[PDB]
Protein backbone atom coordinates (compact mmCIF):
# COMPACT_ATOMS: atom_id res chain seq x y z
CA UNK A 1 0.00 0.00 0.00
CA UNK A 2 0.86 3.68 0.39
CA UNK A 3 2.02 5.67 3.42
CA UNK A 4 0.46 9.08 2.76
CA UNK A 5 -1.60 8.91 5.96
CA UNK A 6 1.51 9.25 8.14
CA UNK A 7 1.34 12.99 7.38
CA UNK A 8 0.66 15.08 10.50
CA UNK A 9 -0.24 18.74 10.11
CA UNK A 10 1.87 21.32 11.94
CA UNK A 11 0.46 24.68 13.05
CA UNK A 12 2.22 27.59 14.75
CA UNK A 13 0.56 29.81 17.35
CA UNK A 14 0.94 33.49 16.53
CA UNK A 15 2.55 35.87 19.05
CA UNK A 16 0.55 36.86 22.10
CA UNK A 17 0.79 40.54 21.11
CA UNK A 18 -0.13 40.10 17.42
CA UNK A 19 -3.10 42.43 18.00
CA UNK A 20 -2.44 45.23 20.47
CA UNK A 21 -4.17 45.68 23.82
CA UNK A 22 -6.12 48.53 22.17
CA UNK A 23 -7.48 46.29 19.35
CA UNK A 24 -5.20 47.65 16.62
CA UNK A 25 -2.98 45.69 14.23
CA UNK A 26 0.43 47.36 14.01
CA UNK A 27 2.77 44.51 12.97
CA UNK A 28 1.91 43.98 9.31
CA UNK A 29 5.50 43.98 8.08
CA UNK A 30 6.84 41.79 10.89
CA UNK A 31 4.02 39.24 10.63
CA UNK A 32 4.28 39.00 6.84
CA UNK A 33 8.01 38.32 7.17
CA UNK A 34 7.42 35.80 9.97
CA UNK A 35 4.76 33.95 7.98
CA UNK A 36 7.16 33.88 5.03
CA UNK A 37 9.61 31.92 7.19
CA UNK A 38 6.81 29.51 8.14
CA UNK A 39 5.89 28.83 4.51
CA UNK A 40 9.58 28.28 3.77
CA UNK A 41 9.54 25.68 6.57
CA UNK A 42 6.54 23.81 5.11
CA UNK A 43 4.17 24.76 7.94
CA UNK A 44 0.51 23.95 7.35
CA UNK A 45 -1.08 26.86 9.22
CA UNK A 46 -1.21 29.14 12.24
CA UNK A 47 -3.43 29.62 15.28
CA UNK A 48 -4.59 32.83 16.96
CA UNK A 49 -6.54 33.89 20.03
CA UNK A 50 -9.52 36.09 19.10
CA UNK A 51 -9.96 38.06 22.31
CA UNK A 52 -13.50 38.80 23.48
CA UNK A 53 -12.05 41.63 25.57
CA UNK A 54 -10.84 43.36 22.41
CA UNK A 55 -13.65 42.71 19.93
CA UNK A 56 -16.61 43.36 22.26
CA UNK A 57 -14.62 45.43 24.76
CA UNK A 58 -16.27 48.82 24.15
CA UNK A 59 -19.86 47.75 24.83
CA UNK A 60 -22.52 45.09 24.28
CA UNK A 61 -22.71 43.99 20.64
CA UNK A 62 -20.16 46.67 19.69
CA UNK A 63 -18.05 44.23 17.71
CA UNK A 64 -14.83 45.57 16.17
CA UNK A 65 -13.23 42.87 14.00
CA UNK A 66 -11.05 45.31 12.05
CA UNK A 67 -7.69 44.31 13.53
CA UNK A 68 -8.29 40.57 13.13
CA UNK A 69 -9.45 40.99 9.53
CA UNK A 70 -6.02 42.48 8.81
CA UNK A 71 -4.15 39.56 10.39
CA UNK A 72 -6.38 37.04 8.61
CA UNK A 73 -5.58 38.74 5.29
CA UNK A 74 -1.86 38.15 5.84
CA UNK A 75 -2.47 34.48 6.68
CA UNK A 76 -4.61 34.10 3.55
CA UNK A 77 -1.97 35.96 1.53
CA UNK A 78 0.64 33.49 2.80
CA UNK A 79 -1.38 30.45 1.69
CA UNK A 80 -1.54 29.21 5.29
CA UNK A 81 -4.47 27.59 7.06
CA UNK A 82 -5.93 29.22 10.16
CA UNK A 83 -7.31 27.96 13.47
CA UNK A 84 -9.32 30.60 15.32
CA UNK A 85 -9.87 30.50 19.09
CA UNK A 86 -13.06 32.09 20.42
CA UNK A 87 -11.25 33.51 23.45
CA UNK A 88 -13.88 34.32 26.07
CA UNK A 89 -11.21 34.52 28.79
CA UNK A 90 -8.71 37.02 30.15
CA UNK A 91 -5.29 37.44 28.58
CA UNK A 92 -2.50 38.10 31.07
CA UNK A 93 -3.52 39.55 34.42
CA UNK A 94 -0.48 38.45 36.41
CA UNK A 95 2.09 40.98 37.59
CA UNK A 96 4.80 40.98 34.94
CA UNK A 97 2.52 40.00 32.07
CA UNK A 98 3.05 42.21 29.02
CA UNK A 99 -0.23 41.59 27.17
CA UNK A 100 -3.24 42.21 29.42
CA UNK A 101 -6.73 41.87 27.93
CA UNK A 102 -9.45 41.32 30.56
CA UNK A 103 -12.94 40.28 29.55
CA UNK A 104 -15.02 43.32 28.52
CA UNK A 105 -15.38 46.02 31.16
CA UNK A 106 -19.16 46.27 30.70
CA UNK A 107 -19.35 42.56 31.55
CA UNK A 108 -17.23 42.97 34.69
CA UNK A 109 -19.26 46.04 35.71
CA UNK A 110 -22.12 43.61 36.40
CA UNK A 111 -19.86 42.11 39.08
CA UNK A 112 -19.95 45.36 41.05
CA UNK A 113 -23.47 44.41 42.19
CA UNK A 114 -23.43 40.65 41.42
CA UNK A 115 -19.92 39.37 42.24
CA UNK A 116 -21.22 35.81 41.83
CA UNK A 117 -20.74 36.05 38.05
CA UNK A 118 -17.14 35.05 38.84
CA UNK A 119 -15.79 31.64 39.78
CA UNK A 120 -15.37 31.78 43.56
CA UNK A 121 -13.31 29.69 45.97
CA UNK A 122 -14.31 28.73 49.50
CA UNK A 123 -12.47 31.73 50.96
CA UNK A 124 -14.64 34.08 48.89
CA UNK A 125 -12.07 35.34 46.39
CA UNK A 126 -13.51 36.13 42.96
CA UNK A 127 -11.65 35.05 39.82
CA UNK A 128 -12.32 37.50 36.97
CA UNK A 129 -10.60 35.51 34.19
CA UNK A 130 -13.82 33.89 33.01
CA UNK A 131 -17.53 33.90 33.79
CA UNK A 132 -18.71 31.05 35.99
CA UNK A 133 -20.63 28.40 34.09
CA UNK A 134 -23.29 28.97 36.76
CA UNK A 135 -24.45 32.04 34.81
CA UNK A 136 -24.47 30.23 31.45
CA UNK A 137 -28.26 30.72 31.40
CA UNK A 138 -28.67 33.68 33.78
CA UNK A 139 -29.73 36.86 31.86
CA UNK A 140 -27.54 39.22 33.89
CA UNK A 141 -25.69 41.07 31.11
CA UNK A 142 -27.97 43.82 29.78
CA UNK A 143 -30.62 41.14 29.32
CA UNK A 144 -28.38 38.47 27.79
CA UNK A 145 -27.13 35.22 29.29
CA UNK A 146 -23.47 34.23 29.06
CA UNK A 147 -24.24 31.59 26.42
CA UNK A 148 -26.11 34.22 24.41
CA UNK A 149 -23.08 36.52 24.55
CA UNK A 150 -20.87 33.66 23.34
CA UNK A 151 -23.26 32.60 20.57
CA UNK A 152 -23.80 36.19 19.40
CA UNK A 153 -20.02 36.72 19.38
CA UNK A 154 -19.42 33.63 17.25
CA UNK A 155 -22.31 34.58 14.96
CA UNK A 156 -20.78 38.01 14.36
CA UNK A 157 -17.45 36.27 13.75
CA UNK A 158 -18.97 34.10 11.01
CA UNK A 159 -20.74 37.04 9.37
CA UNK A 160 -17.66 39.29 9.46
CA UNK A 161 -15.08 36.62 8.53
CA UNK A 162 -17.19 35.27 5.65
CA UNK A 163 -14.36 35.78 3.15
CA UNK A 164 -11.94 33.54 5.04
CA UNK A 165 -14.53 30.86 5.82
CA UNK A 166 -15.73 30.71 2.21
CA UNK A 167 -12.14 30.47 0.93
CA UNK A 168 -11.37 27.63 3.34
CA UNK A 169 -8.55 29.52 5.08
CA UNK A 170 -10.17 28.90 8.47
CA UNK A 171 -10.16 25.15 9.16
CA UNK A 172 -10.83 25.05 12.92
CA UNK A 173 -12.86 27.02 15.46
CA UNK A 174 -11.58 26.39 18.98
CA UNK A 175 -14.23 27.34 21.53
CA UNK A 176 -12.81 28.77 24.74
CA UNK A 177 -14.66 27.23 27.67
CA UNK A 178 -12.81 28.56 30.71
CA UNK A 179 -9.61 30.12 32.01
CA UNK A 180 -6.88 30.18 29.37
CA UNK A 181 -9.52 28.98 26.91
CA UNK A 182 -9.43 25.55 28.57
CA UNK A 183 -12.51 23.63 29.66
CA UNK A 184 -11.74 23.59 33.39
CA UNK A 185 -12.24 25.45 36.61
CA UNK A 186 -9.63 28.08 37.64
CA UNK A 187 -8.31 25.75 40.33
CA UNK A 188 -4.65 26.90 40.31
CA UNK A 189 -4.60 30.70 39.80
CA UNK A 190 -1.21 32.37 40.05
CA UNK A 191 -3.05 35.60 40.88
CA UNK A 192 -4.28 34.10 44.18
CA UNK A 193 -0.99 32.58 45.34
CA UNK A 194 -0.90 29.15 43.69
CA UNK A 195 2.60 27.77 43.18
CA UNK A 196 3.44 24.53 41.38
CA UNK A 197 2.67 21.77 42.47
CA UNK A 198 -0.22 22.87 44.71
CA UNK A 199 -3.30 20.66 44.56
CA UNK A 200 -5.47 23.68 43.75
CA UNK A 201 -8.95 24.32 45.06
CA UNK A 202 -12.53 23.56 44.07
CA UNK A 203 -14.02 26.74 42.62
CA UNK A 204 -17.77 26.11 42.89
CA UNK A 205 -18.71 28.47 45.73
CA UNK A 206 -20.38 31.22 43.73
CA UNK A 207 -24.03 31.42 44.73
CA UNK A 208 -25.26 30.12 41.36
CA UNK A 209 -23.23 26.90 41.52
CA UNK A 210 -23.81 26.42 45.25
CA UNK A 211 -27.56 26.69 44.68
CA UNK A 212 -27.17 24.19 41.85
CA UNK A 213 -25.37 21.73 44.12
CA UNK A 214 -27.92 22.26 46.89
CA UNK A 215 -30.75 21.40 44.49
CA UNK A 216 -28.95 18.31 43.18
CA UNK A 217 -28.10 17.12 46.70
CA UNK A 218 -31.69 17.60 47.87
CA UNK A 219 -33.07 15.71 44.87
CA UNK A 220 -30.58 12.92 45.65
CA UNK A 221 -32.09 12.59 49.13
CA UNK A 222 -29.17 14.21 51.00
CA UNK A 223 -30.06 17.82 51.87
CA UNK A 224 -27.46 17.66 54.67
CA UNK A 225 -24.64 17.53 52.11
CA UNK A 226 -22.70 20.77 51.72
CA UNK A 227 -19.94 21.79 49.35
CA UNK A 228 -16.54 20.47 50.51
CA UNK A 229 -14.95 22.25 53.47
CA UNK A 230 -12.04 19.85 54.09
CA UNK A 231 -10.11 19.99 50.80
CA UNK A 232 -7.36 22.36 51.94
CA UNK A 233 -6.07 25.34 49.97
CA UNK A 234 -4.24 25.98 46.71
CA UNK A 235 -0.72 25.05 47.82
CA UNK A 236 -1.55 22.13 50.11
CA UNK A 237 -0.56 18.56 49.28
CA UNK A 238 -3.11 15.73 49.15
CA UNK A 239 -2.13 14.06 52.44
CA UNK A 240 -2.56 17.30 54.42
CA UNK A 241 -6.30 17.34 53.62
CA UNK A 242 -9.16 15.14 54.77
CA UNK A 243 -10.70 15.24 51.29
CA UNK A 244 -7.71 13.84 49.38
CA UNK A 245 -5.86 11.75 51.99
CA UNK A 246 -5.91 7.96 51.97
CA UNK A 247 -9.47 6.87 52.77
CA UNK A 248 -10.32 10.55 52.47
CA UNK A 249 -13.74 11.95 51.72
CA UNK A 250 -13.19 11.80 47.95
CA UNK A 251 -13.78 8.04 48.31
CA UNK A 252 -17.01 8.44 50.31
CA UNK A 253 -20.51 8.55 48.86
CA UNK A 254 -20.61 12.25 49.74
CA UNK A 255 -17.34 12.92 47.94
CA UNK A 256 -18.18 10.79 44.91
CA UNK A 257 -21.45 12.69 44.50
CA UNK A 258 -19.80 16.12 44.64
CA UNK A 259 -16.99 15.14 42.27
CA UNK A 260 -19.55 13.76 39.81
CA UNK A 261 -21.63 16.93 40.07
CA UNK A 262 -18.51 19.10 39.75
CA UNK A 263 -17.08 17.38 36.67
CA UNK A 264 -20.50 16.87 35.06
CA UNK A 265 -21.31 20.60 35.29
CA UNK A 266 -18.11 21.27 33.34
CA UNK A 267 -18.92 18.66 30.69
CA UNK A 268 -22.44 20.01 30.17
CA UNK A 269 -21.00 23.54 30.07
CA UNK A 270 -18.99 22.51 27.01
CA UNK A 271 -21.82 20.42 25.56
CA UNK A 272 -24.26 23.34 25.41
CA UNK A 273 -21.75 25.90 24.12
CA UNK A 274 -20.54 23.49 21.44
CA UNK A 275 -24.16 22.92 20.44
CA UNK A 276 -24.64 26.66 19.89
CA UNK A 277 -21.29 26.97 18.12
CA UNK A 278 -22.30 24.08 15.84
CA UNK A 279 -25.44 26.00 14.85
CA UNK A 280 -23.49 29.22 14.21
CA UNK A 281 -20.95 27.58 11.89
CA UNK A 282 -23.31 25.10 10.23
CA UNK A 283 -22.30 24.59 6.61
CA UNK A 284 -18.83 26.12 7.06
CA UNK A 285 -15.78 24.02 6.18
CA UNK A 286 -14.51 24.10 9.76
CA UNK A 287 -14.15 21.62 12.59
CA UNK A 288 -15.05 22.64 16.12
CA UNK A 289 -12.54 22.00 18.89
CA UNK A 290 -12.11 22.36 22.63
CA UNK A 291 -8.93 22.65 24.68
CA UNK A 292 -8.21 20.37 27.65
CA UNK A 293 -5.66 21.43 30.25
CA UNK A 294 -2.70 19.21 30.99
CA UNK A 295 -2.82 18.75 34.77
CA UNK A 296 0.05 16.30 35.15
CA UNK A 297 0.94 16.97 38.80
CA UNK A 298 -0.37 14.47 41.37
CA UNK A 299 -1.23 12.07 38.54
CA UNK A 300 1.01 9.44 40.19
CA UNK A 301 -1.07 9.29 43.40
CA UNK A 302 -4.53 7.69 43.75
CA UNK A 303 -6.29 10.97 44.60
CA UNK A 304 -5.33 12.85 41.39
CA UNK A 305 -6.06 15.92 43.48
CA UNK A 306 -4.95 18.56 40.97
CA UNK A 307 -7.02 17.01 38.18
CA UNK A 308 -10.03 16.71 40.49
CA UNK A 309 -10.04 20.36 41.57
CA UNK A 310 -9.68 21.47 37.94
CA UNK A 311 -12.85 19.49 37.15
CA UNK A 312 -11.37 16.31 35.61
CA UNK A 313 -12.78 13.42 37.65
CA UNK A 314 -9.86 11.16 36.76
CA UNK A 315 -8.78 8.28 39.01
CA UNK A 316 -6.82 5.07 38.56
CA UNK A 317 -10.10 3.24 37.84
CA UNK A 318 -12.16 6.14 36.44
CA UNK A 319 -11.37 7.69 33.05
CA UNK A 320 -12.34 11.33 33.49
CA UNK A 321 -11.14 12.23 29.99
CA UNK A 322 -13.00 9.60 27.97
CA UNK A 323 -16.25 10.96 29.39
CA UNK A 324 -15.31 14.33 27.88
CA UNK A 325 -14.38 12.62 24.62
CA UNK A 326 -17.72 10.81 24.59
CA UNK A 327 -19.49 14.17 24.92
CA UNK A 328 -17.55 15.57 21.96
CA UNK A 329 -18.56 12.76 19.58
CA UNK A 330 -22.04 14.13 18.88
CA UNK A 331 -20.53 17.48 17.83
CA UNK A 332 -17.85 15.81 15.67
CA UNK A 333 -15.53 18.04 17.68
CA UNK A 334 -11.78 17.61 17.98
CA UNK A 335 -10.00 17.29 21.31
CA UNK A 336 -6.99 19.60 21.67
CA UNK A 337 -4.53 18.68 24.42
CA UNK A 338 -1.10 19.87 25.60
CA UNK A 339 2.13 18.53 27.16
CA UNK A 340 3.06 17.00 23.79
CA UNK A 341 6.76 17.75 24.42
CA UNK A 342 7.06 16.64 28.05
CA UNK A 343 8.96 13.66 29.44
CA UNK A 344 8.40 12.20 32.90
CA UNK A 345 12.11 12.53 33.71
CA UNK A 346 11.93 16.31 33.14
CA UNK A 347 9.55 16.82 36.09
CA UNK A 348 10.37 16.91 39.80
CA UNK A 349 9.69 13.92 42.04
CA UNK A 350 7.79 15.84 44.73
CA UNK A 351 5.08 16.84 42.22
CA UNK A 352 4.12 13.20 41.51
CA UNK A 353 4.03 14.17 37.85
CA UNK A 354 3.38 11.85 34.89
CA UNK A 355 2.89 13.94 31.74
CA UNK A 356 3.65 11.05 29.37
CA UNK A 357 1.02 8.81 30.96
CA UNK A 358 -1.45 11.70 31.01
CA UNK A 359 -0.89 12.44 27.32
CA UNK A 360 -1.25 8.76 26.47
CA UNK A 361 -4.50 8.48 28.43
CA UNK A 362 -6.04 11.57 26.83
CA UNK A 363 -4.98 10.71 23.28
CA UNK A 364 -6.13 7.11 23.74
CA UNK A 365 -9.49 8.29 25.08
CA UNK A 366 -10.04 10.54 22.07
CA UNK A 367 -8.95 7.83 19.64
CA UNK A 368 -11.19 5.23 21.29
CA UNK A 369 -14.16 7.54 20.65
CA UNK A 370 -13.15 8.15 17.03
CA UNK A 371 -12.24 11.80 17.56
CA UNK A 372 -9.64 13.93 15.89
CA UNK A 373 -6.98 14.55 18.54
CA UNK A 374 -4.53 17.44 18.30
CA UNK A 375 -1.87 18.58 20.73
CA UNK A 376 0.32 21.52 21.69
CA UNK A 377 3.56 21.87 23.58
CA UNK A 378 3.00 23.18 27.10
CA UNK A 379 6.31 25.07 27.42
CA UNK A 380 8.54 26.90 24.97
CA UNK A 381 11.16 24.46 23.67
CA UNK A 382 13.65 24.69 20.80
CA UNK A 383 15.72 21.54 21.41
CA UNK A 384 15.69 18.37 19.33
CA UNK A 385 14.57 16.29 22.32
CA UNK A 386 11.32 18.25 22.68
CA UNK A 387 10.59 17.75 18.97
CA UNK A 388 11.38 14.03 19.22
CA UNK A 389 8.90 13.72 22.09
CA UNK A 390 6.25 15.48 20.00
CA UNK A 391 7.06 13.18 17.08
CA UNK A 392 6.62 10.16 19.35
CA UNK A 393 3.18 11.35 20.46
CA UNK A 394 2.29 12.31 16.87
CA UNK A 395 2.69 8.70 15.70
CA UNK A 396 2.92 6.40 18.76
CA UNK A 397 4.04 3.38 16.71
CA UNK A 398 6.06 5.36 14.16
CA UNK A 399 5.80 5.31 10.39
CA UNK A 400 3.63 2.65 8.77
CA UNK A 401 5.55 2.11 5.53
CA UNK A 402 2.62 0.23 3.91
CA UNK A 403 -0.52 1.91 5.25
CA UNK A 404 -1.98 4.39 7.72
CA UNK A 405 -0.45 4.69 11.19
CA UNK A 406 -2.23 2.71 13.89
CA UNK A 407 -2.99 6.05 15.57
CA UNK A 408 -1.85 9.60 14.96
CA UNK A 409 -2.53 13.16 15.99
CA UNK A 410 -4.75 15.07 13.58
CA UNK A 411 -2.43 18.02 14.12
CA UNK A 412 0.15 19.67 16.31
CA UNK A 413 0.34 23.37 17.17
CA UNK A 414 3.68 24.83 18.27
CA UNK A 415 3.74 27.41 21.08
CA UNK A 416 4.79 29.90 19.95
CA UNK A 417 5.86 32.03 16.98
CA UNK A 418 8.73 34.41 17.74
CA UNK A 419 11.84 35.81 16.11
CA UNK A 420 14.09 33.42 18.07
CA UNK A 421 12.22 30.50 16.49
CA UNK A 422 13.02 31.81 12.99
CA UNK A 423 16.79 32.31 13.41
CA UNK A 424 19.87 30.12 13.43
CA UNK A 425 19.84 26.55 14.68
CA UNK A 426 16.38 27.03 16.19
CA UNK A 427 14.87 27.56 12.74
CA UNK A 428 16.90 24.77 11.13
CA UNK A 429 15.84 22.34 13.86
CA UNK A 430 12.20 23.43 13.55
CA UNK A 431 12.22 22.92 9.78
CA UNK A 432 13.62 19.40 10.18
CA UNK A 433 10.84 18.74 12.71
CA UNK A 434 8.14 19.74 10.22
CA UNK A 435 9.74 17.44 7.64
CA UNK A 436 9.49 14.48 10.01
CA UNK A 437 5.91 15.31 11.00
CA UNK A 438 5.16 15.25 7.26
CA UNK A 439 6.98 11.91 6.97
CA UNK A 440 9.41 13.46 4.46
CA UNK A 441 6.51 13.82 2.01
CA UNK A 442 6.74 17.62 1.81
CA UNK A 443 4.13 20.25 2.55
CA UNK A 444 0.67 19.30 1.25
CA UNK A 445 -1.60 22.36 0.90
CA UNK A 446 -4.63 20.11 0.29
CA UNK A 447 -4.26 17.52 3.07
CA UNK A 448 -7.29 16.76 5.24
CA UNK A 449 -9.94 18.85 3.44
CA UNK A 450 -12.66 19.92 5.86
CA UNK A 451 -16.20 18.83 5.04
CA UNK A 452 -19.07 21.30 5.48
CA UNK A 453 -20.00 21.28 9.16
CA UNK A 454 -23.09 19.17 9.84
CA UNK A 455 -25.53 19.58 12.71
CA UNK A 456 -24.70 17.96 16.03
CA UNK A 457 -26.24 14.56 16.69
CA UNK A 458 -28.93 14.27 19.39
CA UNK A 459 -27.89 15.14 22.93
CA UNK A 460 -26.89 12.15 25.05
CA UNK A 461 -28.32 11.28 28.45
CA UNK A 462 -25.65 11.95 31.04
CA UNK A 463 -25.61 8.19 31.68
CA UNK A 464 -24.18 7.58 28.20
CA UNK A 465 -21.37 10.07 28.82
CA UNK A 466 -20.65 8.55 32.24
CA UNK A 467 -20.62 5.03 30.76
CA UNK A 468 -17.25 5.91 29.20
CA UNK A 469 -15.62 6.40 32.62
CA UNK A 470 -15.55 2.69 33.46
CA UNK A 471 -14.13 0.15 32.84
CA UNK A 472 -10.96 2.23 32.52
CA UNK A 473 -8.93 0.83 29.63
CA UNK A 474 -5.18 0.65 29.22
CA UNK A 475 -3.76 3.24 26.80
CA UNK A 476 -2.85 2.25 23.28
CA UNK A 477 0.85 1.30 23.11
CA UNK A 478 3.33 4.14 22.65
CA UNK A 479 6.92 3.59 21.55
CA UNK A 480 9.56 5.06 23.84
CA UNK A 481 11.20 6.97 20.96
CA UNK A 482 10.20 8.11 17.50
CA UNK A 483 11.53 6.20 14.49
CA UNK A 484 12.09 9.55 12.70
CA UNK A 485 14.25 11.52 15.14
CA UNK A 486 15.53 15.05 14.62
CA UNK A 487 19.28 15.53 14.87
CA UNK A 488 20.23 17.88 17.72
Author numbering: 3 to 490
Publication passage describing the model:
The wheat β‐amylase (Tri a 17) has been found to bind IgE of wheat allergic patients, but its structure and allergenic activity have not been studied. To evaluate its possible clinical relevance and to shed some light on its biochemical properties, we elucidated the three‐dimensional structure, measured the enzymatic activity, IgE‐binding capacity, and allergenic activity of the recombinant enzyme. The β‐amylases of crop plants like wheat, soy, or barley have been under investigation for decades and the presence of two general forms has been described. One protein isoform found in all parts of the plant, termed ubiquitous β‐amylase, and one variant specific to the endosperm, featuring an elongated C‐terminal tail region are known.
A refolding attempt yielded soluble, yet misfolded and aggregated protein. However, we were able to optimize the expression conditions to obtain natively folded amylase (named Tri a 17_active). The crystal structure of Tri a 17_active shows the same (β/α)8‐barrel architecture found for other plant and bacterial β‐amylases. The structure superimposes well with the previously published structure of barley β‐amylase (rmsd = 0.62 Å when 442 of 486 Cα atoms are aligned with the PDB structure 2XFF5), which was used as the template for molecular replacement. The enzyme shows a tolerance for low pH, showing maximum activity at pH 5 and retaining over 80% of its maximum activity even at pH 4. The protein is most stable in slightly acidic conditions. A maximum in melting temperature is seen at pH 5.5 with 59°C, with a tail off to lower values as pH increases and a sharp drop in stability at pH 4. Tri a 17_clone and Tri a 17_inactive were recognized by 24% (4 of 17) of wheat food allergic patients with varying intensities, whereas the folded enzyme (Tri a 17_active) was recognized by 41% (7 of 17) of wheat food allergic patients, indicating the presence of conformational IgE epitopes as well as linear epitopes. Since the enzymatic activity depends on the correct fold, there is an apparent correlation between enzymatic and allergenic activity of the β‐amylase.
